[PDB]
Design a binder for this molecule. Sequence first.
Ligand SMILES: CC1(n2cnc3cnc4[nH]ccc4c32)CCN(S(C)(=O)=O)CC1
Length: 298
Amino acid sequence: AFEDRDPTQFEERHLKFLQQLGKGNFGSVEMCRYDPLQDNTGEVVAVKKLQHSTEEHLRDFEREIEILKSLQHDNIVKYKGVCYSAGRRNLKLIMEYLPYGSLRDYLQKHKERIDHIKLLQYTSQICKGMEYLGTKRYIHRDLATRNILVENENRVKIGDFGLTKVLPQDKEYYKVKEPGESPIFWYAPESLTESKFSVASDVWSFGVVLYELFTYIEKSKSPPAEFMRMIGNDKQGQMIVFHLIELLKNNGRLPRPDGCPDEIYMIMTECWNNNVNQRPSFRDLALRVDQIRDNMAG
Ligand SMILES: CC1(n2cnc3cnc4[nH]ccc4c32)CCN(S(C)(=O)=O)CC1
């Protein structure tokens, strides 16, 4: 006898591994098939599992799952459910499978299908996803083309909410002192110096995403390569951070990509403002981008 009142619970025995897809924040995403009829008419899903798990990490994973579940938007990756694997003594996150993978990889592998109009289309979509995120007071903390997904030519979706934080109701920034490796070449100055994350710091990072888009992931032009080149490729360890901070605090910036219109570089530049409160909002950004796109079409 059987009654299914929870389609967000995926049965372990019907979830079959197909392929590995890629690493994400403290974990790993794999391509799986969910086939509860064993007739091979089921759907392909993306499944995230933790790597090197612990009690703390599992609790974080649980918060990420609830964050993802709370989100419903065309430009945010779809939550599908959970799988309580290991005879219900483990946790896995079930997500939609997006065939073209990360935007970073897609930009590199399909340059022939990409032009400025498309880049702006994606820029717009990312902004709108981020508008949506702000309505829930979620601070993403890891905006980057590696964490943006491509559904098709005409649509991208924000992913990896593994670092995402919810603003504590009475505050406008979240201070997160954390051990291990941070993606420093996407961090706002106050995130580097004070560990302070906010909607504004996501706007900073979006500026770096916009840069990424107009470099087409050329290699040698990536934020890390550029910053390291500016800082000195010799530098190791903490010295890297010291010089990046100093560099940013005194107006050192990623250069304008070759072929990038002045107007688009201006947007990057405004996002990269040391004055947190002078940065534009995601709503300002989507409107400006869409107005550029609308004014270009002729
Ligand atoms: C590479 C990626 N991926 C490649 N093909 C995919 C297909 N579907 C996916 N769903 C979620 C991620 C994902 C895919 C899996 C890992 N990430 S993440 C956001 O976890 O850092 C980027 C996307």
